[PDB]
């Protein structure tokens, strides 16, 4: 039974229905390794390396998805190198191509580039879910753009705002995180071909000293992998600073989400909101997931700081554990946020009452600045105006309404629209 | 295929042969929940609560290890509460005991206490492995207690030490971490019975207001669970400050191990040591695992800081992901350290040469303080003494030898001996 | 003007009246360096090193507190080594002792040991303030041991507790932090004399090879410095793992305090408490200070992990910035907590009302378990009992009262009493 | 004496000559507060608020830099609010303007906006120093673009590279950090006018309900403060997510710098480089400073996550301590890096020898791939080619040379050139 052994709670519970569970699986990674060896073979052939035949390539393409795990496992045992084992395994499936698989390339060629492909694919799915989450929150905000409630500083009544303005305040936190992850996705650079230390000496020799062919190969493989950007300067691997940026972008989602979810939990305790005695359990799961993403950046940064010269392998086990975990955690977090925003509702009776218990004083503070219970005379020059505000709280909310609408129409939608359907 | 879905690399790779994979499994946790309900039932009966019959208890004890996962899963679906689902499931297996299962107790009774039992058991196994690791390092140190090499500050020659003194320097870092985890294990407090908010009101009513019976029950269950200490004051759960201490103790192992492994990696690069071109891959895996434990404390501390009043559930998902991960990471780290120390060896030819290229100058520095190539006269009062040191480097190492032996005999062994066999 | 240049906000604002500002000053550190050179001189003389005369020692003791900063500054310039500069400066003040100052010792002798003395002294003051803080909270708890209020899970009504039980829940968090810092203080180990790499070779030669004299000197200096424990095994410095423990203990205070202060801020927002519209500004400052201590442990752990072989100086600037900051932050935090607990009060009218709006339902839940508005019949066997609970909420709080008293009398007081007056 | 009290080691030692010490001083902050009140007054007047006279504004502009600290201090005492105290103080200096100072604005108006101005100014200076640092490293790299040395993986010989390629590898890490901080600087958004809760209700009333005037005022003040971007949506303060981005950008500098400095420290230990027995003390200070920036991001992220609703003040003390510290630490780090790169040199004799001891084997590995000591026959088809590589190591470095030049000319210079002179 699967329950008899420790299991990833993210994979088996919080993200069981996410495509990330497939994207980040060993099978998909090994598949990407083969796909990369395929593209490498195709590009080298296209560039004149005759030793790579079309028959060899056809075997590779035909057997890309065929995995003999029992065999692969024994191979990873005889020789303690996964890449070598998989190359050997792929070699036995494609005997004609066996000799040219990974020709001139380093193991890091498939390892690093497969991670980048797996990561970006995962990020693309996260971005679609992210957009939906933000869209749901925008819907909630518009729906409540004119529902008055008390603004709070130190968690205490400070003025009057609208549920919608606050909804947009939360929306902005999430939108800025979205924009960060969105920009990271556009700027992500592919490693391409760089050799074992980054000099490309093996490929150069392979091309009899022609550097333009080495550059063309690097560009060609990058193009096949569907990347617009690639590193030109590297050691054995692409800069781990790129991974820090990846983790940080997701940590922004965590910080933003935790602020939003804690607000909802507090507001629910105040009796103002109700997430889909009713406990805000979804919001609490949201804070737990968010807390994890928030505490991840410093490890990624330390990984970079710990990289020795052209490369030290103290990053492998660390990257293998860290990155897939944050990607999945972010997805589980977004799924939760989506549930919350789809059914989040306002306890209008409680909100109206909270507003009524505070509006007299906010009115008094208002009269004092402009300078019922104000028949002195002394408020004679501001009595009617204040009374009007008290009978129409919405006029006590400054520009909450227009701010809410313009932000959504001119900033939020234009930003996420391209990710929604 | 298991490879087709994301898997915990710790569970499936770095710790596949560890009993922690069984101890931290869902099956073991659910089993502990049942064991706790059993002990609760036994204690309540022993204390006079007649509603708990021996037949009910016998059903429970007989069916403790019988799991109908397909049923349990559907139950966790109809009702979104694992504990309730498992209670229901255990109830169907024991129809006579169904009505008294968890009588007066809260879900946290099994949840919190099962974690504590699972954690301590895991810690006990970690401590046995830890002791073996330290023992191996002590063996290495004794073997090299008189093998001279250069001491280094800023990674550069500063004097002469012995490989063994350095081995004991590393041993102390690990021993202090061991002592921290060892003390934490002895001081760990059980939650026992506390009710949903920590007042024990349900048990009090159950005992018709007799507080001594409530206290006796709390003590009795703690005794059955094999804990010498228990909290008296709590909210719904036992203080998450205890979990911070747990994570911190393991972070000490990480800091210590990373310092040791980085030293070995650097020494191997210098050509002085060789872990079992030879790359220090095991030491690198050690730094990656260590880095993870080092970056965990702040999350545990934040979990405590985030706990609201008697309890907020923003800690569950967080604890479920954090603690089992650090426990497993520590075990994988210790397994690696053990491999390293069992076959770590000294490249005596290289060490001897490094010592020879530096000993002339260390000798010169020595003569200068006491005040061949010193025939001036000027060194006439210290020439023979220095020459003697250069022909016998070991006499240039101060008290390295006695320090190494006394530390091992009087501090290291007495501390770990009780955990070795 | 001092305002014209960046200033430490801790030193100039949050701790301006604390003795830590004097204890952690450069003058006190240099003074400790001189005191250490004095003790070293005395011990070496007591052990037979005739070159150290009583006249030399008298100069040193007489001029220990005389600082010519302008001169010292120019000296720290000509030669880029503070210790050497101060030795030179102290040498000019004591021309007879100039030649034997720091005889056989390394710079780290004064640096590391002065830090330990400064740190422990700072910790002792922190412990006295800590005890007072806990004492104030215990006073508050006893005063409210029978003031009923609602218990909360997910920040929502879950039962009835007493303000005092909650006060003791907070008290325990702080007490466990206190015990950690208190134990660290008792176990703190002195570096003593160890040489530049930890072998004590210089002192050995100084004593003509007699190791017992080296050990006696190490013990003697430790005794003069008033330390019961000292390291026997070290590299150039004492293990930075000790500093991690120091920072972690203070991080426990931060986690505990933040949980307590956040609870108070939330309770004040609920209208249940009032710290000395009233905003909980002191509690907010408490969370900010606490947050800083919580985010410090991982840096200290990384410092240890980064230590290369016998020593790398990448820890100096880091330690100089980190440790004094956490010590001061903890003191500022404790001062704030003290203010809060001395005037914290309960809004009894609001609490009574909150209890009344919830007690009917808690009563209903109570009747359901035991099995006005219960005249069915159906509650006929529990109507009077529940009605009694509703007319006497205190009987609805389980063992809150006895738990509060026994914890304070048997755990809290015995622990802090020795630090209060 | 200043030495008699704890001092900021950054302000008094590591950055004593930096303009950040002036920019981040209390005097400069209070000056910015006054400047902001001045701009607010000017804009409100320009927009029709007649109550603001030109005489009032002239007093303010004339007395902007006049500080009566003794008075200000007593004022900060009578009333426990710095902003109110400074307003009062500025009011006494400008009796005609006293009544309209900060008209309609919140304290956060000067607090938040002054921080943003102080921060950006500090960042601008950091960017100029950063550019110089990168320029120095590029100079070093070009100078050594053809100096061959061994490439290293696991800190061990893996191939041949050029000192310059490695220099450019380091340069890229720093350049990516530079680009991050550079982009953050361009995107930084001003808070502008938003009211106490973000609704701008006070300004709206002040403009008799005309929203365009409120928007114009917000835009006008932003323009006067010299900001191209401003937030439209906020609570009381501008999003603390912006501060997380600020801290993270600087943490990138720390991660990059630590990787670079650790490499230099290791290379110096190998005898390949020498920073300006020679210990790499500057590089060690660099790692200590870098470590601090690396461990800062998570606190900034937690600050955001902890922000309650429109605002909670648990961020003030935290921000006041965190941000100025990282800004100064980054400046001290850059100053150190600059020193290092200006005099960093290669120990050409040692490098040449290290290359010679390894080039035979690298040659053997090379021959094996293409398929003296190779006279078999068996190498007959590759003997001359390999021999040529061994007599000309530079041809063994793949594309190191062209990569180094193109990166510097096409990526590094175009990026930093605008910041150098």
mmCIF file of C-alpha atoms in Angstrom, chain B residues 8-288:
data_model
loop_
_atom_site.group_PDB
_atom_site.id
_atom_site.type_symbol
_atom_site.label_atom_id
_atom_site.label_comp_id
_atom_site.label_asym_id
_atom_site.label_seq_id
_atom_site.Cartn_x
_atom_site.Cartn_y
_atom_site.Cartn_z
ATOM 1 C CA UNK B 8 9.754 12.501 -2.746
ATOM 2 C CA UNK B 9 13.439 12.147 -3.582
ATOM 3 C CA UNK B 10 14.157 11.672 0.136
ATOM 4 C CA UNK B 11 11.696 8.806 0.569
ATOM 5 C CA UNK B 12 12.413 7.084 -2.738
ATOM 6 C CA UNK B 13 16.122 7.775 -3.040
ATOM 7 C CA UNK B 14 18.155 9.232 -0.148
ATOM 8 C CA UNK B 15 16.327 7.302 2.605
ATOM 9 C CA UNK B 16 14.700 4.351 0.807
ATOM 10 C CA UNK B 17 16.210 1.893 3.301
ATOM 11 C CA UNK B 18 15.489 3.930 6.429
ATOM 12 C CA UNK B 19 12.837 2.940 8.985
ATOM 13 C CA UNK B 20 11.811 6.612 8.969
ATOM 14 C CA UNK B 21 10.030 5.951 5.674
ATOM 15 C CA UNK B 22 7.778 3.553 7.620
ATOM 16 C CA UNK B 23 7.642 5.599 10.825
ATOM 17 C CA UNK B 24 6.547 8.741 8.959
ATOM 18 C CA UNK B 25 4.037 6.985 6.672
ATOM 19 C CA UNK B 26 0.298 7.635 6.752
ATOM 20 C CA UNK B 27 -0.283 4.028 7.799
ATOM 21 C CA UNK B 28 1.934 4.389 10.848
ATOM 22 C CA UNK B 29 0.322 7.694 11.770
ATOM 23 C CA UNK B 30 -3.208 6.261 11.533
ATOM 24 C CA UNK B 31 -1.977 3.268 13.510
ATOM 25 C CA UNK B 32 -0.712 5.604 16.235
ATOM 26 C CA UNK B 33 -4.080 7.374 16.252
ATOM 27 C CA UNK B 34 -5.758 4.048 16.960
ATOM 28 C CA UNK B 35 -3.148 3.138 19.553
ATOM 29 C CA UNK B 36 -3.824 6.453 21.289
ATOM 30 C CA UNK B 37 -7.586 5.926 21.217
ATOM 31 C CA UNK B 38 -6.844 2.488 22.682
ATOM 32 C CA UNK B 39 -4.730 3.891 25.524
ATOM 33 C CA UNK B 40 -7.325 6.587 26.138
ATOM 34 C CA UNK B 41 -10.027 3.918 26.393
ATOM 35 C CA UNK B 42 -7.923 1.775 28.722
ATOM 36 C CA UNK B 43 -7.052 4.668 31.038
ATOM 37 C CA UNK B 44 -10.625 5.974 31.188
ATOM 38 C CA UNK B 45 -11.782 2.457 32.077
ATOM 39 C CA UNK B 46 -9.046 2.025 34.687
ATOM 40 C CA UNK B 47 -10.244 5.292 36.208
ATOM 41 C CA UNK B 48 -13.857 4.238 36.590
ATOM 42 C CA UNK B 49 -15.639 5.227 33.376
ATOM 43 C CA UNK B 50 -17.808 2.104 33.126
ATOM 44 C CA UNK B 51 -19.186 2.984 29.680
ATOM 45 C CA UNK B 52 -15.883 1.680 28.294
ATOM 46 C CA UNK B 53 -16.149 -2.124 28.300
ATOM 47 C CA UNK B 54 -13.354 -4.667 27.958
ATOM 48 C CA UNK B 55 -15.078 -6.072 24.860
ATOM 49 C CA UNK B 56 -14.941 -2.671 23.197
ATOM 50 C CA UNK B 57 -11.250 -2.394 24.027
ATOM 51 C CA UNK B 58 -10.536 -5.906 22.725
ATOM 52 C CA UNK B 59 -12.088 -5.087 19.353
ATOM 53 C CA UNK B 60 -9.903 -1.992 19.128
ATOM 54 C CA UNK B 61 -6.710 -3.832 20.047
ATOM 55 C CA UNK B 62 -7.503 -6.695 17.705
ATOM 56 C CA UNK B 63 -8.280 -4.429 14.734
ATOM 57 C CA UNK B 64 -5.630 -1.772 15.350
ATOM 58 C CA UNK B 65 -3.603 -2.701 12.272
ATOM 59 C CA UNK B 66 -6.451 -3.443 9.862
ATOM 60 C CA UNK B 67 -6.756 -0.738 7.208
ATOM 61 C CA UNK B 68 -9.459 -0.515 4.531
ATOM 62 C CA UNK B 69 -7.895 2.387 2.657
ATOM 63 C CA UNK B 70 -10.422 2.472 -0.186
ATOM 64 C CA UNK B 71 -13.138 2.900 2.445
ATOM 65 C CA UNK B 72 -11.084 5.359 4.497
ATOM 66 C CA UNK B 73 -10.506 7.446 1.366
ATOM 67 C CA UNK B 74 -14.195 7.683 0.498
ATOM 68 C CA UNK B 75 -14.821 8.619 4.137
ATOM 69 C CA UNK B 76 -12.232 11.385 4.029
ATOM 70 C CA UNK B 77 -14.258 12.632 1.058
ATOM 71 C CA UNK B 78 -17.847 12.552 2.361
ATOM 72 C CA UNK B 79 -16.585 14.352 5.451
ATOM 73 C CA UNK B 80 -13.554 16.627 5.057
ATOM 74 C CA UNK B 81 -11.885 15.609 8.318
ATOM 75 C CA UNK B 82 -9.242 12.886 8.427
ATOM 76 C CA UNK B 83 -9.556 12.202 12.158
ATOM 77 C CA UNK B 84 -13.345 11.930 11.963
ATOM 78 C CA UNK B 85 -13.004 9.679 8.909
ATOM 79 C CA UNK B 86 -10.525 7.381 10.659
ATOM 80 C CA UNK B 87 -12.654 7.349 13.803
ATOM 81 C CA UNK B 88 -15.653 6.372 11.680
ATOM 82 C CA UNK B 89 -13.564 3.725 9.892
ATOM 83 C CA UNK B 90 -12.206 2.365 13.178
ATOM 84 C CA UNK B 91 -15.759 2.524 14.489
ATOM 85 C CA UNK B 92 -17.093 0.239 11.761
ATOM 86 C CA UNK B 93 -14.344 -2.282 12.547
ATOM 87 C CA UNK B 94 -15.229 -2.113 16.244
ATOM 88 C CA UNK B 95 -19.047 -1.655 16.396
ATOM 89 C CA UNK B 96 -19.146 -2.347 20.142
ATOM 90 C CA UNK B 97 -16.540 0.358 20.812
ATOM 91 C CA UNK B 98 -17.814 2.795 18.178
ATOM 92 C CA UNK B 99 -19.619 4.934 20.740
ATOM 93 C CA UNK B 100 -16.711 5.365 23.154
ATOM 94 C CA UNK B 101 -13.821 5.876 20.739
ATOM 95 C CA UNK B 102 -12.036 9.153 21.598
ATOM 96 C CA UNK B 103 -14.553 9.698 24.420
ATOM 97 C CA UNK B 104 -14.102 13.244 25.719
ATOM 98 C CA UNK B 105 -10.972 13.810 23.635
ATOM 99 C CA UNK B 106 -10.309 16.223 20.774
ATOM 100 C CA UNK B 107 -8.943 15.307 17.329
ATOM 101 C CA UNK B 108 -5.714 17.002 18.349
ATOM 102 C CA UNK B 109 -5.400 14.250 20.938
ATOM 103 C CA UNK B 110 -4.332 11.749 18.278
ATOM 104 C CA UNK B 111 -2.885 14.249 15.797
ATOM 105 C CA UNK B 112 -0.502 16.052 18.151
ATOM 106 C CA UNK B 113 0.423 12.998 20.216
ATOM 107 C CA UNK B 114 0.938 10.795 17.170
ATOM 108 C CA UNK B 115 3.317 13.395 15.732
ATOM 109 C CA UNK B 116 5.262 13.446 18.993
ATOM 110 C CA UNK B 117 5.510 9.647 19.042
ATOM 111 C CA UNK B 118 6.465 9.444 15.364
ATOM 112 C CA UNK B 119 8.986 12.269 15.789
ATOM 113 C CA UNK B 120 10.640 10.814 18.868
ATOM 114 C CA UNK B 121 10.858 7.358 17.318
ATOM 115 C CA UNK B 122 12.460 8.960 14.253
ATOM 116 C CA UNK B 123 14.816 10.905 16.501
ATOM 117 C CA UNK B 124 15.814 7.716 18.329
ATOM 118 C CA UNK B 125 16.869 6.107 15.043
ATOM 119 C CA UNK B 126 18.655 9.287 14.027
ATOM 120 C CA UNK B 127 20.561 9.249 17.321
ATOM 121 C CA UNK B 128 21.764 5.682 16.785
ATOM 122 C CA UNK B 129 22.989 6.573 13.301
ATOM 123 C CA UNK B 130 24.441 9.819 14.646
ATOM 124 C CA UNK B 131 26.433 7.936 17.299
ATOM 125 C CA UNK B 132 27.800 5.556 14.663
ATOM 126 C CA UNK B 133 28.826 8.503 12.507
ATOM 127 C CA UNK B 134 30.677 10.163 15.381
ATOM 128 C CA UNK B 135 32.259 6.825 16.310
ATOM 129 C CA UNK B 136 33.577 6.411 12.760
ATOM 130 C CA UNK B 137 35.025 9.916 12.789
ATOM 131 C CA UNK B 138 36.678 9.219 16.162
ATOM 132 C CA UNK B 139 38.218 6.060 14.698
ATOM 133 C CA UNK B 140 39.574 8.077 11.774
ATOM 134 C CA UNK B 141 40.980 10.688 14.161
ATOM 135 C CA UNK B 142 42.711 8.177 16.429
ATOM 136 C CA UNK B 143 44.195 6.426 13.401
ATOM 137 C CA UNK B 144 45.679 9.753 12.310
ATOM 138 C CA UNK B 145 46.402 11.230 15.733
ATOM 139 C CA UNK B 146 50.075 11.521 14.794
ATOM 140 C CA UNK B 147 49.905 12.186 11.070
ATOM 141 C CA UNK B 148 51.272 15.704 10.733
ATOM 142 C CA UNK B 149 49.830 18.198 8.250
ATOM 143 C CA UNK B 150 49.651 21.988 7.998
ATOM 144 C CA UNK B 151 47.149 23.953 10.047
ATOM 145 C CA UNK B 152 45.304 26.589 8.037
ATOM 146 C CA UNK B 153 43.844 30.041 8.656
ATOM 147 C CA UNK B 154 42.269 31.817 5.651
ATOM 148 C CA UNK B 155 42.772 28.375 4.075
ATOM 149 C CA UNK B 156 46.513 29.022 4.193
ATOM 150 C CA UNK B 157 49.417 27.458 6.090
ATOM 151 C CA UNK B 158 49.539 28.848 9.619
ATOM 152 C CA UNK B 159 51.254 26.095 11.591
ATOM 153 C CA UNK B 160 51.395 22.351 11.952
ATOM 154 C CA UNK B 161 48.586 20.234 13.357
ATOM 155 C CA UNK B 162 47.706 16.566 13.058
ATOM 156 C CA UNK B 163 45.032 15.132 10.808
ATOM 157 C CA UNK B 164 43.600 13.703 14.026
ATOM 158 C CA UNK B 165 43.348 16.996 15.877
ATOM 159 C CA UNK B 166 41.413 18.359 12.916
ATOM 160 C CA UNK B 167 39.331 15.185 12.913
ATOM 161 C CA UNK B 168 38.489 15.886 16.552
ATOM 162 C CA UNK B 169 37.718 19.513 15.723
ATOM 163 C CA UNK B 170 35.095 18.202 13.299
ATOM 164 C CA UNK B 171 34.013 15.553 15.816
ATOM 165 C CA UNK B 172 33.288 18.252 18.390
ATOM 166 C CA UNK B 173 31.024 20.179 16.024
ATOM 167 C CA UNK B 174 29.026 17.017 15.380
ATOM 168 C CA UNK B 175 29.130 15.977 19.063
ATOM 169 C CA UNK B 176 27.669 19.308 20.199
ATOM 170 C CA UNK B 177 24.862 18.847 17.670
ATOM 171 C CA UNK B 178 24.400 15.287 18.959
ATOM 172 C CA UNK B 179 24.179 16.521 22.547
ATOM 173 C CA UNK B 180 21.579 19.118 21.545
ATOM 174 C CA UNK B 181 19.387 16.535 19.796
ATOM 175 C CA UNK B 182 20.032 14.076 22.624
ATOM 176 C CA UNK B 183 18.895 16.580 25.266
ATOM 177 C CA UNK B 184 15.847 17.554 23.203
ATOM 178 C CA UNK B 185 14.891 13.878 23.087
ATOM 179 C CA UNK B 186 15.089 13.565 26.888
ATOM 180 C CA UNK B 187 13.111 16.752 27.518
ATOM 181 C CA UNK B 188 10.396 16.232 24.886
ATOM 182 C CA UNK B 189 6.988 16.736 26.449
ATOM 183 C CA UNK B 190 3.842 14.792 25.603
ATOM 184 C CA UNK B 191 0.586 16.707 25.009
ATOM 185 C CA UNK B 192 -1.597 14.141 26.752
ATOM 186 C CA UNK B 193 -5.251 15.044 27.221
ATOM 187 C CA UNK B 194 -6.074 18.769 27.189
ATOM 188 C CA UNK B 195 -9.404 19.201 25.430
ATOM 189 C CA UNK B 196 -10.087 21.350 22.363
ATOM 190 C CA UNK B 197 -8.809 24.563 23.966
ATOM 191 C CA UNK B 198 -6.624 23.221 26.758
ATOM 192 C CA UNK B 199 -9.076 23.450 29.668
ATOM 193 C CA UNK B 200 -9.998 19.742 29.849
ATOM 194 C CA UNK B 201 -13.610 20.743 30.494
ATOM 195 C CA UNK B 202 -14.964 17.703 28.620
ATOM 196 C CA UNK B 203 -12.959 15.241 30.692
ATOM 197 C CA UNK B 204 -13.880 17.110 33.881
ATOM 198 C CA UNK B 205 -17.589 16.756 33.146
ATOM 199 C CA UNK B 206 -16.914 13.140 32.202
ATOM 200 C CA UNK B 207 -15.472 12.619 35.692
ATOM 201 C CA UNK B 208 -18.282 14.537 37.385
ATOM 202 C CA UNK B 209 -15.996 17.413 38.376
ATOM 203 C CA UNK B 210 -13.173 15.384 39.922
ATOM 204 C CA UNK B 211 -9.983 17.164 38.811
ATOM 205 C CA UNK B 212 -7.629 14.542 40.227
ATOM 206 C CA UNK B 213 -9.172 12.010 37.854
ATOM 207 C CA UNK B 214 -8.555 14.371 34.922
ATOM 208 C CA UNK B 215 -4.945 14.782 36.042
ATOM 209 C CA UNK B 216 -4.633 11.036 36.606
ATOM 210 C CA UNK B 217 -5.979 10.381 33.111
ATOM 211 C CA UNK B 218 -3.497 12.847 31.618
ATOM 212 C CA UNK B 219 -0.680 11.160 33.519
ATOM 213 C CA UNK B 220 -1.942 7.666 32.768
ATOM 214 C CA UNK B 221 -2.153 8.168 28.989
ATOM 215 C CA UNK B 222 1.274 9.814 29.018
ATOM 216 C CA UNK B 223 2.658 6.793 30.866
ATOM 217 C CA UNK B 224 1.128 4.345 28.388
ATOM 218 C CA UNK B 225 2.624 6.326 25.498
ATOM 219 C CA UNK B 226 5.996 5.895 27.225
ATOM 220 C CA UNK B 227 6.672 9.590 27.919
ATOM 221 C CA UNK B 228 8.268 10.798 31.151
ATOM 222 C CA UNK B 229 7.314 14.417 30.552
ATOM 223 C CA UNK B 230 4.093 16.081 29.497
ATOM 224 C CA UNK B 231 2.779 19.602 29.169
ATOM 225 C CA UNK B 232 0.375 20.778 31.858
ATOM 226 C CA UNK B 233 -0.342 24.107 30.226
ATOM 227 C CA UNK B 234 -1.510 24.203 26.601
ATOM 228 C CA UNK B 235 -4.075 25.629 24.232
ATOM 229 C CA UNK B 236 -5.488 23.110 21.776
ATOM 230 C CA UNK B 237 -2.002 21.862 20.864
ATOM 231 C CA UNK B 238 1.321 21.486 22.639
ATOM 232 C CA UNK B 239 3.581 24.530 22.168
ATOM 233 C CA UNK B 240 5.014 24.821 18.662
ATOM 234 C CA UNK B 241 8.098 26.164 20.427
ATOM 235 C CA UNK B 242 8.947 22.504 21.025
ATOM 236 C CA UNK B 243 8.941 21.926 17.263
ATOM 237 C CA UNK B 244 11.285 24.896 16.768
ATOM 238 C CA UNK B 245 13.692 23.290 19.195
ATOM 239 C CA UNK B 246 13.429 20.029 17.250
ATOM 240 C CA UNK B 247 14.197 21.721 13.928
ATOM 241 C CA UNK B 248 16.981 23.814 15.446
ATOM 242 C CA UNK B 249 18.738 20.778 16.905
ATOM 243 C CA UNK B 250 18.773 19.246 13.428
ATOM 244 C CA UNK B 251 19.939 22.552 11.968
ATOM 245 C CA UNK B 252 22.966 22.272 14.294
ATOM 246 C CA UNK B 253 23.767 18.942 12.655
ATOM 247 C CA UNK B 254 23.500 20.685 9.284
ATOM 248 C CA UNK B 255 25.770 23.602 10.211
ATOM 249 C CA UNK B 256 28.348 21.258 11.745
ATOM 250 C CA UNK B 257 28.192 18.763 8.895
ATOM 251 C CA UNK B 258 28.454 21.477 6.240
ATOM 252 C CA UNK B 259 31.557 22.910 7.914
ATOM 253 C CA UNK B 260 33.074 19.412 8.078
ATOM 254 C CA UNK B 261 32.149 18.428 4.535
ATOM 255 C CA UNK B 262 33.309 21.725 3.050
ATOM 256 C CA UNK B 263 36.635 21.217 4.850
ATOM 257 C CA UNK B 264 36.944 17.733 3.356
ATOM 258 C CA UNK B 265 36.052 19.005 -0.128
ATOM 259 C CA UNK B 266 38.694 21.717 0.159
ATOM 260 C CA UNK B 267 41.282 19.315 1.586
ATOM 261 C CA UNK B 268 40.580 16.868 -1.208
ATOM 262 C CA UNK B 269 41.119 19.681 -3.714
ATOM 263 C CA UNK B 270 44.433 20.391 -1.957
ATOM 264 C CA UNK B 271 45.275 16.727 -2.499
ATOM 265 C CA UNK B 272 45.432 15.929 1.225
ATOM 266 C CA UNK B 273 42.390 13.671 1.588
ATOM 267 C CA UNK B 274 40.348 11.251 -0.488
ATOM 268 C CA UNK B 275 36.766 10.333 0.363
ATOM 269 C CA UNK B 276 35.636 6.770 -0.470
ATOM 270 C CA UNK B 277 40.431 12.421 -10.814
ATOM 271 C CA UNK B 278 38.502 11.657 -7.631
ATOM 272 C CA UNK B 279 35.663 14.066 -6.858
ATOM 273 C CA UNK B 280 34.311 14.493 -3.297
ATOM 274 C CA UNK B 281 30.757 13.751 -4.446
ATOM 275 C CA UNK B 282 29.596 12.341 -1.111
ATOM 276 C CA UNK B 283 30.811 15.456 0.681
ATOM 277 C CA UNK B 284 28.981 17.590 -1.852
ATOM 278 C CA UNK B 285 25.734 15.707 -1.265
ATOM 279 C CA UNK B 286 26.455 16.298 2.416
ATOM 280 C CA UNK B 287 26.640 20.085 1.934
ATOM 281 C CA UNK B 288 23.379 20.106 -0.062
#
